């Protein structure tokens, strides 16, 4: 027989939305955050739920460790964290960095080579053994 909607469990006689392994009425297939129907617009999926682009990025987009905002544009990934390209910088002198720089990991923060050299010897000796 004809498809049945996944949200209201009723037969779909007219136009059918095919998404996430289910069939939907156009009005009943909506974003999980805001209750707004996609109406043809691209949807984004996450854990069996559909979201609009703006709310998808807000809930699941990478957040910058420095400016604490959802990153727009390219992401710098390092040390289990993420930075905006223009935010990535040394944690001890704030000089901007790229992944092409030789920085060290210090309590899971990036520290530039020049800064690390200035650390106390007793600390550097302990960090090597760790």
């Amino acid at each position: 027989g004809v498809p049945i909607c996944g949200a209201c469990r009723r037969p779909i006689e007219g136009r059918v939305v095919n998404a996430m392994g289910k069939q939907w009425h156009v009005e009943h297939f909506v974003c999980a955050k805001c209750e707004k129907p996609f109406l043809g617009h691209r949807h984004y999926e996450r854990k069996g739920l559909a979201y609009c682009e703006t709310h998808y990025n807000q809930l699941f987009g990478d957040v910058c460790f420095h400016c604490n905002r959802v990153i727009e544009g390219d992401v710098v990934s390092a040390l289990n964290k993420a930075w905006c390209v223009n935010c990535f910088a040394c944690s001890t002198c704030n000089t901007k960095l790229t992944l092409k720089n030789k920085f060290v990991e210090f309590d899971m923060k990036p520290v530039c080579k020049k800064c690390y050299e200035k650390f106390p010897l007793e600390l550097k000796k302990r960090l090597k053994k760790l």
């Binding site: 289990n80 899971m108 200035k118």
Partner: protein
Amino acid sequence: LKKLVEESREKNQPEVDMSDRGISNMLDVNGLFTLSHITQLVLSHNKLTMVPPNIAELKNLEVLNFFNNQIEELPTQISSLQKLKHLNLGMNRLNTLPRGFGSLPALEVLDLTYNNLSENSLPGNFFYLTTLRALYLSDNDFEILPPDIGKLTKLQILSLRDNDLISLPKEIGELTQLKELHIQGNRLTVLPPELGNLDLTGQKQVFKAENNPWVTPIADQFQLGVSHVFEYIRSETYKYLYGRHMQ
């Protein structure tokens, strides 16, 4: 130094970098405290022993970095910075923080690594800093972490590496946002079961706990992996043994 101040006011540069310039006194930096427009000030790797109350005049500061000086105390005015989000006091000589330090309304990252702080160093209102998402207390002298640590509900990162902790407060279990817990190099023997309310087994998460005199079953579970550790401290067996270990 008189050219990094003049050019910052002429071209309206919000970021001032005076790292490693042999500065022994901020009041000696000509015109520094007239730059009310700046949002970032870096004074790391200098020779500062103090911070003057004039710091309050830089009212738009969002980033303030004093890493690796010899600062021994801070003025109360440090907490009047309404826009301050990042404060690096790492590698100094602090054994106290000033009255009302916890009044900073927007502070997100606080770095106190490598000083001489203990629980007694913290002002009564320290844990009013509820906007904090990262707190670094590595290389200090904490024996006890106050239970009010639980008031810091947005905390994602907590480092207590290389302190003198004999115990972890169960209130750490209330930190539902926590992603990183660094507790290497203390004097911990057991973990509170309430820590199991947290899950730090994720790929993006960190749980570092080496170099503690853990009781044998906990040390054994570490050798198997973080998943095993958290499974264990959630178990009825651990709860039974923990209750008897305390009494």
